[PDB]
């Protein structure tokens, strides 16, 4: 510490590790958080069994419990910083400066693609691509088709 015997060339790479822990904290807190939200905000009766004064009471009890949880991770994902695992360059996701499937910044994607490190395939810079789905409706459509095979092809039970 205090720049004595530092192992990595960029110190900020460590931040990337910190980020990982954030996601970990979210896995630990998501279910809990969301349940406490849903039970708190519910105006209709909770159920046949819990109604009226009991329900009001229980609602307040729960949001009191949720406020008491120190360090519970409530931060929405789009507000977490995206930072490269390689050069610790940052980019805004949903922008052309962040590349989502490798999760690296434009700067690193460029460097890694041009000196061959990533295996990708070059496609004409101006179109939609080789891909059928993108060719049809662009980004939104492909987004949809991904939803369709993750979820909708199942008739859940």
């Amino acid at each position: 510490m205090r720049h004595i015997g530092q192992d990595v060339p960029k110190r900020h790479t460590h931040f990337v590790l910190e980020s990982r822990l954030m996601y970990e904290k979210s896995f630990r807190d998501c279910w809990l958080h969301s349940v406490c939200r849903a039970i708190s905000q519910l105006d209709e009766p909770l159920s046949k069994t819990v109604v009226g004064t009991h329900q009001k009471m229980l609602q307040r009890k729960v949001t009191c419990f949720q406020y008491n949880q120190y360090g519970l991770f409530k931060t929405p994902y789009y507000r977490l910083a995206n930072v490269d695992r390689y050069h610790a360059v940052q980019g805004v996701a949903g922008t052309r400066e962040w590349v989502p499937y490798v999760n690296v910044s434009y700067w690193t994607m460029n460097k890694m693609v041009r000196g061959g490190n990533l295996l990708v395939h070059r496609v004409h810079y101006t179109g939609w691509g080789t891909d059928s789905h993108l060719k049809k409706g662009g980004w939104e459509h492909r987004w949809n088709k991904v939803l369709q095979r993750n979820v909708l092809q199942y008739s859940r039970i």
Binding site: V113, R114, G115, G116, R122, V123, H124, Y125
Partner: protein
């Protein structure tokens, strides 16, 4: 002047002496000049035009077993119409030598883009957006 310094590369199991003097220079006013060309076994024999001096039994074996080179050249040029080859201007040039022995606002920047025979094909370090010579961006429908 903040004069840049380059430290010599010594020969290595993958990086032999001639590779080093030819691909690496310690004087950095000579960087980014241009490509140098050299010749190997056959292209050297073509460029250097070494007349073969006559020799022992193999050389006369190959003076008697030679056949018509006027014809062989012709055949090899023709053979480019075969399904697995192209027709070469080089093959033609060799035949010729044996017979005669006695848009427009951008085509600086389109310089790779037609159907181009290559020598060295371009590579992704040196070419940003080019797709390759075989590519058809605006295909027609053919039965």
């Amino acid at each position: 002047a903040k004069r840049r310094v380059i430290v010599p590369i010594h020969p290595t199991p993958n990086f032999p002496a001639h590779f080093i003097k030819s691909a690496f220079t310690t004087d950095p006013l000579k960087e980014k000049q241009k490509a140098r060309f050299s010749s190997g076994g056959e292209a050297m024999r073509e460029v250097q035009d070494i007349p073969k001096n006559l020799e022992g039994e193999r050389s006369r074996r190959d003076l008697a077993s030679r056949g018509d080179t006027e014809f062989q050249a012709l055949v090899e040029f023709i053979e480019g119409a075969s399904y697995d080859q192209l027709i070469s201007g080089r093959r033609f040039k060799k035949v010729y030598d044996v017979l005669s022995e006695n848009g427009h606002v951008m085509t600086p920047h389109t310089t790779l883009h037609g159907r181009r025979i290559f020598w060295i094909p371009p590579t992704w370090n040196r070419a940003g957006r080019f797709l390759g010579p075989h590519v058809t961006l605006y295909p027609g429908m053919t039965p």
